[PDB]
């Protein structure tokens, strides 16, 4: 009765991995080879379409972090690599009078280094932070990168301002947007639309604090791979932000020397006024109901019996156990131990913050880059909009973790899916083709 | 629940025009074929024309093909057919029909499923 | 609606919409890798068609009869009651089979038609 | 001649080198890009003529009828006293209309003809 | 037999696996190139079946008569006792030739074909 | 033996200022001048 | 025996067996590896 009938243009689709294309609105995230983003992109709702997603298996983190390392190495590849700054230094304390907690952390460090000409040599003198300088044993010392591999500096013109980066598919797939509120990563969405690419992602880079991304639609939304395996991350987005105020009191002077033809090394200069500690100012009353929101959502996961207690990262290295963020082209380590320090049971907060100036991002061993100074104050203001927590018995204990990188940028991808177009089937139709 | 209403003219002379239009209630008109069937006064039924539920495709008895055109719209829930010249022998009671034809999608039909009360048009 | 805007809609309904998912099929070296990639599977669809006997058309009809194994259910259930989703799912054990008697059937209408054509 | 030797010449005469043209259509990234989107251009314009219902096809009528608002010049005036450069540039303002209905076109044509093929 | 399992067998024999081949024929930078030109070959393939009048036909008669110049052999002689790589030796001298005429064939039918479709 | 298709009854207006092709050419004899030199000798210790 | 010409004695003779001749190897001796660091990033190994 019925025969078969070949149908081309249907819209079915299956889960696919690709390859992305940019699209965007100096900086080291703007990319030359990548194209202008849609004034005015679309969107087409889906009615009736019920789309599973699983942010844990979402390939775009992926993608988004090779491209993340790709753009950072390929802009910071051609400019000055400092092989000669690995010398033996004699240093002594910028200020011994000083009884401030910045005490012995500047160091005033004096070094030979090189000149234009391959036969002449010159005396430098600099200011180093404690951080970045390891004794070798008016002391001797040696840059921590000496043990690990040579330092590249970062171009002085190179931004490193994120840029929000849109996300758009290649001809013959698309981008399903969950659009659900209140999803939690996994499982389906009943407000499913398809677009052609994703609103900007600010490639911002921290650590245990997220920072200028997107708010909870209604409450807080705690996202977890597996809530009860204690190795998985947790992920904490906010429906409210918190502002957070980070300052650089210290009008500090930046000096240069040239290292070869063609090379020149920046270094920080004198300090002008008193040394100051960096820090981050953070009201305490809007932090407390932020956090007591968290523990109310966790309860939800865990009992209305239970107490949940916050503590301070455990031991390890500077990059992991505080927060770290890029600041005016300064990179801050913080602290946080104010932060999550508290039992919960059924006017501001200043944090710490050191500055050190030979970078290892991204878990790497042996990419060391040095950041130039920044002359004068910095300030930045930022809007915390989700946590990192890990989990360590009638009290729970968490602490910040974090460190993983793509945790970030998961945090933003989990609402998308990239699905593959086969727009090629058959069904039974009461229509025979003519015969011979 | 489902009617059909036959509205038309009355008596025509030969080498005139008469247009017959059925007007439908109690069921989607766009998702059925509609037709004309007519009935001398002393015989019994013939097929005079077949239009698809969308209107664009249709079909005609050859005894009338060059004079009656078949037309639909969905929107006014209206059949028309509009005939010329009217011969002695088309004096009839014209009935408009659903049924007889199913756009492929459908489950077949080839048969007339409802009826209106008919129209007599003299010449 | 436009791109994909009938998926969630009847199997039915959807078919008026087939021109505009085709338009969005076909619109640094692993970009360019993937350009390629879809501009082979673009033509690997496109070849599938022409073998069938179907060409440039979006809506084929062939004289392979349905098994009535491949799915029971009855015509008006599959056309107002259904998605392609659900449809394609419900179907897929049995795409290589119905695929492979669309090709033959071609090739057997193409000798015919050559035979007949060869009648003075 | 050759390769837009017609170019000149009235849209009668030009219309009898139509193969000329299509057969040099289709004739160090950078360069495989250019390749590249060579094919993705040649595609989309053998798709548009596959939705048209022309495929495989230099000279294709079809059912639209002539505004008349597009163009108001008399047949023989077009076809006998203008270049195709000429008429390009007349009528560049309704390409996307006349694009439009032509895709409209076919759809009626194609369910048309499955309803057609339905009948026992 | 698969691909190519045909190659040493008749031409009669041999026209039942024309999909066979067919299918086989789509299936770093320069790795990249070699796909690209790949994709250009086959693209220059159907663009000169689709010239001819044939497009998407795998067996496709024409209005070109044989000259018996290009070859005098008798019909079964070359059907039954002679295989494709024989015969594509045999008449290479002339695959110019026959192109070109199939080429004017078929734009000499395309304008009959549109002058009978202007008739009223 | 290169093609030349003298084009009959054509006016095509040039404007050679606004020529993508000097970019192109450009581009290309930059290119190559610094692939042809890159593998070579970097007088480092000349610098003296 | 395969060759290009064998006429040729310029030509290579490539001579394909149709059984396998084992051949046993040994370095026998006991040999240290020590290794340096010769700059950030950088080390090498030498015999010992
Ligand atoms: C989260 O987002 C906020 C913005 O909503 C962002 O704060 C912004 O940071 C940038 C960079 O630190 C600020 O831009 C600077 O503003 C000062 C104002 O005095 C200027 O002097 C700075 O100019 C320097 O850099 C230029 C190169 O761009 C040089 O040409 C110039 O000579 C100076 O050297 C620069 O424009 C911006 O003002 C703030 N915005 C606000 C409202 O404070 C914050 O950093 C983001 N957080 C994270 C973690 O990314
Ligand atoms: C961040 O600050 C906290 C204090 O608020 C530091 O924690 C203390 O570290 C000392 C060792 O220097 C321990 O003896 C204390 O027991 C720790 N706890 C407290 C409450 O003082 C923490 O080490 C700081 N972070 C870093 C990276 O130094
Ligand atoms: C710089 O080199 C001179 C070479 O005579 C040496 O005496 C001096 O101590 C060096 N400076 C430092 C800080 O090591
Ligand atoms: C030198 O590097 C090693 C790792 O290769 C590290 O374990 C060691 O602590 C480093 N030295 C110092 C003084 O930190
Ligand atoms: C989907 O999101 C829109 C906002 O874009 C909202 O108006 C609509 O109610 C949502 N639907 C559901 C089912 O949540
Ligand atoms: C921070 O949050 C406020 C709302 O509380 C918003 O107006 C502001 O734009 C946010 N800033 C950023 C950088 O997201
Ligand atoms: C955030 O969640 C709390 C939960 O009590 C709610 O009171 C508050 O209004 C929410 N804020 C927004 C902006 O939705
Ligand atoms: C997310 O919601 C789904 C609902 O099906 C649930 O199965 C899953 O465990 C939830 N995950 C978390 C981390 O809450
Ligand atoms: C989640 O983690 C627990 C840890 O004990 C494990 O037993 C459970 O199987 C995990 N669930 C999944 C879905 O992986
Ligand atoms: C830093 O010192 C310079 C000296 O010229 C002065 O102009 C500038 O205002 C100072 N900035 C601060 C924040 O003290
Ligand atoms: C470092 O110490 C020397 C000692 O003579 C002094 O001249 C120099 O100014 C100091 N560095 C800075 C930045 O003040
Ligand atoms: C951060 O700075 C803004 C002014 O830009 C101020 O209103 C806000 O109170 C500051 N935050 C804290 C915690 O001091
Ligand atoms: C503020 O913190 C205290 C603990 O120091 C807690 O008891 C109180 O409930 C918190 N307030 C809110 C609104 O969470
Ligand atoms: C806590 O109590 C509320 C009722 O007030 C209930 O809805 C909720 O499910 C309880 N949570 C747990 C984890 O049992
Ligand atoms: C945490 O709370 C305790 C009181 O329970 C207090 O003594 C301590 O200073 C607070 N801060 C830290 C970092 O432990
Ligand atoms: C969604 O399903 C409902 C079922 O009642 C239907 O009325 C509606 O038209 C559907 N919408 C679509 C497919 O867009
Ligand atoms: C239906 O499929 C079975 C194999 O699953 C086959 O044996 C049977 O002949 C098929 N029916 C028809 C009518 O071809
Ligand atoms: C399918 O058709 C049969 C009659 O052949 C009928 O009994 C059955 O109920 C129908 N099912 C549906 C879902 O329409
Ligand atoms: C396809 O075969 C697998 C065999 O395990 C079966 O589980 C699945 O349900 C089958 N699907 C259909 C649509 O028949
Ligand atoms: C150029 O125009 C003249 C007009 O008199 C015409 O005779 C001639 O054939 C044309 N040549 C072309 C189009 O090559
Ligand atoms: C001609 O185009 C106008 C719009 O510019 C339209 O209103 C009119 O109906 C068209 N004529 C025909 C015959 O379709
Ligand atoms: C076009 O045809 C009309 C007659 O319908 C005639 O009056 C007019 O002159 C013609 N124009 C041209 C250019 O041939
Ligand atoms: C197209 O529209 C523009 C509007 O500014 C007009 O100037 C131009 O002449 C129009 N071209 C045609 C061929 O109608
Ligand atoms: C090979 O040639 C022999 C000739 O006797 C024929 O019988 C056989 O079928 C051929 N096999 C092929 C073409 O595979
Ligand atoms: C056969 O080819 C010759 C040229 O080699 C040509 O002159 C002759 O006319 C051709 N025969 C036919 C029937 O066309
Ligand atoms: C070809 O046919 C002729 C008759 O026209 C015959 O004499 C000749 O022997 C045949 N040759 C072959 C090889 O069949
Ligand atoms: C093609 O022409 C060449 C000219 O040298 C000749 O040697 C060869 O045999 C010819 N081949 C055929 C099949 O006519
Ligand atoms: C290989 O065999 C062929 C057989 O035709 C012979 O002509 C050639 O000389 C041989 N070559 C060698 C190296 O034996
Ligand atoms: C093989 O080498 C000899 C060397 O004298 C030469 O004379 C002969 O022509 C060569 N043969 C070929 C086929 O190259
Ligand atoms: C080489 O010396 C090491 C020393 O630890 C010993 O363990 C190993 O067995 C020796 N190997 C031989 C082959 O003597």
């Known amino acids: 009765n019925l025969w078969v009938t070949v149908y081309y243009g249907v819209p079915v689709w299956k889960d696919a991995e690709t390859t992305l294309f940019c699209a965007s609105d100096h900086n080291v995230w703007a990319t030359h080879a990548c194209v202008p983003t849609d004034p005015n992109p679309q969107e087409i709702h889906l009615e009736n379409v019920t789309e599973e997603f699983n942010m844990w298996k979402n390939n775009m983190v992926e993608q988004m972090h090779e491209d993340i390392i790709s753009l950072w190495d390929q802009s910071l590849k051609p400019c000055v690599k400092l092989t000669p700054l690995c010398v033996t230094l004699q240093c002594t304390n910028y200020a011994p009078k000083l009884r401030s907690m910045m005490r012995g952390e500047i160091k005033n460090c004096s070094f030979n280094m090189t000149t234009e000409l391959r036969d002449k040599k010159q005396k430098v003198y600099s200011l180093f932070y404690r951080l970045d300088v390891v004794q070798i044993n008016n002391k001797e010392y040696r840059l921590i990168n000496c043990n690990t591999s040579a330092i590249t500096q970062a171009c002085p013109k190179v931004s490193f301002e994120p840029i929000p980066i849109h996300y758009c598919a290649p001809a013959g797939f698309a981008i399903l947007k969950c659009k659900d509120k209140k999803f939690n990563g996994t499982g389906p969405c009943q407000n499913v639309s398809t677009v052609q690419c994703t609103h900007g992602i600010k490639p911002v880079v921290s650590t245990q604090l997220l920072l200028n991304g997107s708010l909870a639609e209604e409450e807080v939304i705690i996202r977890s791979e597996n809530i009860t395996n204690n190795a998985k991350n947790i992920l904490v987005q906010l429906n409210t932000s918190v502002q957070i105020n980070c300052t650089r009191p210290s009008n500090n002077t930046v000096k240069s020397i040239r290292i070869g033809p063609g090379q020149a090394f920046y270094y920080f200069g004198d300090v002008l006024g008193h040394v100051r500690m960096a820090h981050c100012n953070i009201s305490k009353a809007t932090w407390n109901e932020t956090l007591g929101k968290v523990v109310k959502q966790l309860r939800k996961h865990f009992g209305n019996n239970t107490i949940i207690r916050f503590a301070q990262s455990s031991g390890g290295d500077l990059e992991v156990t505080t927060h770290s963020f890029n600041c005016g082209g300064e990179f801050f380590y913080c602290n946080t131990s104010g932060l999550f320090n508290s039992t919960w049971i059924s006017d501001s907060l200043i944090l710490p913050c050191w500055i050190k100036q030979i970078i290892n991002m991204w878990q790497r061993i042996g990419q060391a880059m040095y950041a130039p100074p920044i002359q004068g104050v910095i300030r930045c203001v930022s809007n915390i909009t989700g946590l990192i927590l890990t989990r360590d018995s009638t009290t729970e204990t968490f602490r910040p973790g974090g460190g993983d990188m793509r945790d970030n940028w998961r945090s933003e991808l989990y609402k998308y899916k990239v699905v593959k177009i086969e727009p090629l089937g058959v069904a039974p139709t009461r229509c025979k083709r003519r015969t011979v | 629940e489902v009617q059909l209403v036959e509205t038309g003219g009355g008596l025509v002379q030969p080498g005139g025009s008469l247009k017959l239009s059925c007007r439908a209630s109690?069921?989607?008109?766009?998702?059925?074929?509609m037709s004309w069937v007519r009935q001398a006064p002393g015989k019994g039924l013939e097929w005079v024309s077949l239009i698809n539920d969308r209107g664009g495709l249709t079909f005609y008895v050859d005894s009338v093909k060059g004079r009656f055109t078949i037309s639909r719209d969905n929107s006014k829930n209206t059949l028309s057919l509009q005939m010329h010249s009217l011969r002695d022998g088309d004096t009839a009671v014209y009935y408009c029909?659903?049924?007889?034809?199913?756009?492929?999608?459908?489950?077949?039909?080839?048969?007339?499923?409802?009826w209106g009360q008919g129209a007599l048009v003299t010449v | 609606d436009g791109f994909l805007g009938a998926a969630g809609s009847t199997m039915g309904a959807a078919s008026m919409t087939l021109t505009v998912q085709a338009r969005n099929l076909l619109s640094g070296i692993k970009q360019l890798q993937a350009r390629v990639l879809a501009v082979e599977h673009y033509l690997r669809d496109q070849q599938l068609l022409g073998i069938w006997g179907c060409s440039g058309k979006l809506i084929c009809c062939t004289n392979v009869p349905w098994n009535s194994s491949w799915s029971n259910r009855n015509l008006s259930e599959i056309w107002d009651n259904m998605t392609w989703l659900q449809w394609d799912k419900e179907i897929s054990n049995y795409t290589q089979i119905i695929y492979g008697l669309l090709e033959e059937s071609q090739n057997q209408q193409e000798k015919n038609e050559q035979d007949l054509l060869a009648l003075d | 001649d050759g390769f837009l030797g017609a170019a000149g010449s009235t849209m009668g005469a030009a219309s009898m080198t139509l193969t000329v043209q299509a057969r040099n259509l289709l004739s160090g990234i950078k360069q495989l890009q250019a390749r590249v989107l060579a094919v993705e251009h040649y595609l989309r314009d053998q798709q548009l003529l596959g939705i048209w219902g022309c495929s495989g096809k230099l000279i294709c009528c079809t059912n639209v009828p002539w505004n008349s608002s597009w163009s108001n010049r008399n047949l023989s005036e077009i076809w006998d006293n203008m270049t195709w450069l000429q008429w390009d540039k007349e009528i560049s303002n309704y390409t996307q209309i006349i694009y439009g209905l032509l895709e409209e076109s076919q759809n009626q044509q194609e369910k048309n003809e499955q309803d057609l093929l339905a009948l026992d | 037999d698969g691909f190519l399992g045909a190659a040493g067998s008749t031409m009669g024999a041999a026209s039942m696996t024309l999909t066979v081949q067919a299918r086989n024929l789509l299936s770093g930078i320069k790795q990249l190139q070699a796909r690209v030109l790949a994709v250009e070959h086959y693209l220059r393939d159907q663009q000169l079946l689709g010239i001819w009048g044939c497009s998407g036909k795998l067996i496709c008669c024409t209005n070109v008569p044989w000259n018996s110049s290009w070859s005098n052999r008798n019909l079964s002689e070359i059907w039954d006792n002679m295989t494709w790589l024989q015969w594509d030796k045999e008449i290479s001298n002339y695959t110019q030739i026959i192109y070109g005429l199939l080429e004017e064939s078929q734009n000499q039918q395309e304008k009959n074909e549109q002058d009978l479709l202007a008739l009223d | 033996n290169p093609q030349e298709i003298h084009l009959e009854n054509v006016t095509e207006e040039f404007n050679m200022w606004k020529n993508n092709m000097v970019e192109q050419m450009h581009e290309d004899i930059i290119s190559l001048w610094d692939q042809s030199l890159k593998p070579c000798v970097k007088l480092t210790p000349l610098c003296v | 025996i395969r060759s290009e010409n064998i006429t040729n004695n310029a030509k290579n003779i490539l001579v394909q067996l149709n059984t396998s001749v084992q051949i046993n190897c040994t370095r026998p001796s006991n040999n240290t590896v020590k290794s340096i660091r010769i700059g950030p990033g950088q080390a090498f190994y030498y015999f010992g």
């Open positions: 029909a659903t049924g007889g034809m199913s756009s492929a999608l459908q489950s077949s039909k080839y048969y007339f499923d409802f």
């Open positions: 109690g069921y989607t008109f766009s998702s059925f074929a």
